[PDB]
Symmetry: D2
Subunit: 158 residues, 4 copies
């Protein structure tokens, strides 16, 4: 059966490039892959249900970025992929800027065979110990809106 | 601040032993610990609600250890956050999925909060490989239901779906 | 084929109890184990060559504590166990008190399928960040002779 | 002090990509990095001896990244220790074993120094499972010998011993 690896951590944690590390292993192994993102080729989809459109009978790897943005229906969708022998690799955020769990990421962490926690550089103190995202301006965006911080700095800042 | 470590995996994956390894590091390092379990031996306080923990944590407590977290109220998520913010490291061990492969919610919340996650494997009861990630029930389709070998077996995904 | 897991870190890192976590998985799985230590049952042996005396045709797990003290001949001995389908789990020290590599542990880390790095509590600063052992009085012994420290404290102390 | 992370595994296990993920974290965090490679693109300095590194590390360097460490002189062990003691985090990627399953000594020394070790898997060239841990040579029984797909293949232990 397939194995599920979940990569997670705050923003600016190298999660996408880490997921791409796995994509490269499969392509190098001459294995068929399917890559997804929410709204080589990454298929932009909106619902998890839509992945079965793009999965082939010889698809071996399925890679999903930004999993926080998907419906929790992804849990059961991933489970079925695993039961078919398809390896799944997911990246996304574990917590919101309010330190509430992203529900979909949480379900996947529970399902995972392996979990990789990535850290970022703390925006405030400059150490390689950042595990949280602080919001400074669901809301898409980047360094103009979110910074990565350690727990100590978060608490000093909010 | 404190870090949170979560140890998870199916039954029979040596999760309690793993947690006790960490208790030991703090016991050898001269630090006050609190060990808790829900309503596995070193003087664990038995507690019903997570907020009952505050009572047992003194000003010099440096580590808080919690077994079988799947049985705790999800309000554990906020209680753990508070300890972390106070500089208390927390180590948790629990089951990640039920026998029906549904997530345990308290466990899943703590997984999202964790700084480090240790996923543990068990021996597959049917095939005997070191690859079992799921717990199958074998003697009631109730999700919360105490027991040992007489009621639950650890399996890999393939043997799970074969036995289902 | 077998898989090799190596547990390592400084003294007072919970390495023995972690190795025993694995021993318990096999015994619970009703699997035959063989446990070793250098000079349930742990067989006290002096050389790696002596392990083949105690390994059965249905031995599935082989557990080796204090691997720093074994001859580097253990590398090839472990390799052959793996090729036979026997899972191997080893614990021991990565560095001496002078921060020189323990040669046998180093060879095993290179062979390992999984490496677990354990930390201890720093004797000087009290944080859970100790990765080194400082000597304060090959030389067997314990807390009367060695303490665990973080790199910063080691360097302050030596 | 600085921490050392070592990424290792056989060929085709995405080790360089893994290392670049860490380079990125420091690039997004506004910190000076130094990337090095022996005599894989972001402006890596090409160096013959490890001690040639000192030249390229300025007073505000917070991370030092080294690809293909198996090719460096073992005197890298002492050079890395010095950076760590100076508060510079170091990330290293290299092969753990030769094609004959002998350890690479520079890699093994750094493995013992590491605070964190990331073991990476490749796809097995023969069986196609996500479980390959070894590199087999397929086109000279020399241990140090440059090449790609034309000369080395990644395999699991079973397929290695089958092809041997
Ligand atoms: C941290 C966080 C990020 N995001 C978004 C911002 C980014 O576009 C994306 C993470 O790359 O997630 C939220 O919607 N909410 C949050 O709380
Ligand atoms: C797997 C599983 C275990 N349990 C119990 C069995 C044990 O008494 C305890 C696990 O240590 O969890 C449940 O209540 N439901 C389940 O689905
Ligand atoms: C750290 C260290 C430990 N040891 C011994 C002390 C203990 O008896 C054993 C580790 O438990 O190793 C050495 O011989 N040399 C060293 O440098
Ligand atoms: C596996 C292996 C690789 N190499 C080289 C091949 C590549 O040029 C480089 C790995 O990135 O290492 C050796 O020199 N010897 C070996 O045994
Ligand atoms: Zn900070
Ligand atoms: Zn099985
Ligand atoms: Zn210290
Ligand atoms: Zn193979």
């Amino acid at each position: 059966s397939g194995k599920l690896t979940v990569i997670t951590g705050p923003m600016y944690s190298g999660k996408t490039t880490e997921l791409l590390s796995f994509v490269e292993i499969y392509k190098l192994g001459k294995k068929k892959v399917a890559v997804f993102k929410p709204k080589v080729e990454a298929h932009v989809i909106e619902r998890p249900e839509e992945m079965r459109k793009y999965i082939e009978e010889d698809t071996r790897g399925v890679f999903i970025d930004e999993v926080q943005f998907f419906n929790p229906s992804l849990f059961e969708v991933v489970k079925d992929l695993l039961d078919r022998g398809i390896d799944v690799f997911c990246a996304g955020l574990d917590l919101t800027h309010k330190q509430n769990p992203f529900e979909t990421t949480a379900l996947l962490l529970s399902l995972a065979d392996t979990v990789i926690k990535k850290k970022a550089v703390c925006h405030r103190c400059g150490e390689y110990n950042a595990t949280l995202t602080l919001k400074v301006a669901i809301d898409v965006g980047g360094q103009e809106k979110y910074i990565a911080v350690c727990r100590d700095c978060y608490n000093t800042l909010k």
